[PDB]
Amino acid sequence: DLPKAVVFLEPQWYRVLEKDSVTLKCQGAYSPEDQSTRWFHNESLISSQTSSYFIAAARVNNSGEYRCQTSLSTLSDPVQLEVHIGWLLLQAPRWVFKEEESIHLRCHSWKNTLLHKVTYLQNGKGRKYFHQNSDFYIPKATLKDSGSYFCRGLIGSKNVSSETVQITITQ
Template identity: 70%
Template sequence: MWQLILPTALVLTAFSGVRAGLQKAVVILDPEWVRVLEEDNVTLRCQGTFSPEDNSTKWFHNQSLISHQDANYFIKSARVNNSGTYRCKTALSTLSDPVQLDVHIGWLLLQTTKWLFQEGDSIQLRCHSWKNKPVNKVTYLHNGKGKKYFHKNSEYCIPKATYNDSGSYFCRGLIGQKNISSASIHISIGDPMSPSSFPPWHQITFCLLIGLLFAIDTMLYFSMQRGLQSSVADYEEPKFHWSKEPQDK
């Protein structure tokens, strides 16, 4: 019995560890663009679980700890040296996945919310000017061909991405009398069934542990049943030898 109960206890301990590992912090960009121009303002928000004793947040820029402990990290008038990866963690949350922020110099920048999309995702693109100067007669181009034209600057949305939407994008428009084009960016459309789209390792481990726990409990149940049946089978009713009392002779 104890030989089966001990593995069950170990699985339950591991199961608790996995549940704790599921608490991962998340970094969110506000606004959500991963590419910005110098002098743009950006806020990075850390979503995680805090303890009553410790409500501080640890922030990392390019793997180096930065001296900021608030859940919101505000970058005012961004500079190129603000580019890089950002991660955060809280008292009850593990280190987040990295979020890349790129700061560029120029008059016009094509912005995107991420680089890799899945089929069916909505793609949002923005032709962004330095200090938000007015841009007119804006054209969005895909692989060198015009895709969308706006008399007044506006965001370009692809409601449901397909493989054909992969490729190079840039925008151009008029700032004052100057005809300006942005640099090109490459956007990829992935397969939802690709390995990168599979559940994270800790979710797979969680499911395996649940299955293992069920198997051990089942083995324990049938082992107890066999033990009870064996006890009944080994039981023999005692035989009594009756003798008559003297007066019955």
């Protein structure tokens, strides 16, 4: 039993819109004579041989679980990627947080189209407003931060909203 390799998302958002870029990175030990990495998507080997797997323009079928293995590691745990269709997407680095952790939320527009007059909502109520698009940080989460979140804004002069994301805070 060798240590597990680990997959990381860069940037950290596990939910992305179609046409976003995503890099999966593998961390694991290599034997000197074998510097190659094996990648899996949906439990099937894929064609990347490098420690980074780059998705230049995400599509719905890039969704699923990824795993990787290096020559001196065991197969990593799966990391899930969700590719969504929409004009707006509420992004988070995960959906489960422990009390007192920081929560970084982002209202992301398709193709980074310019967005303004952004509201973040929790449980159907306005929670934070920004005249200009800005991320939303909860520096120290409490049980009061559990709920259904979404965001809304103006693209040009049309209102758009994102779908909701459940965020759960644990003890």
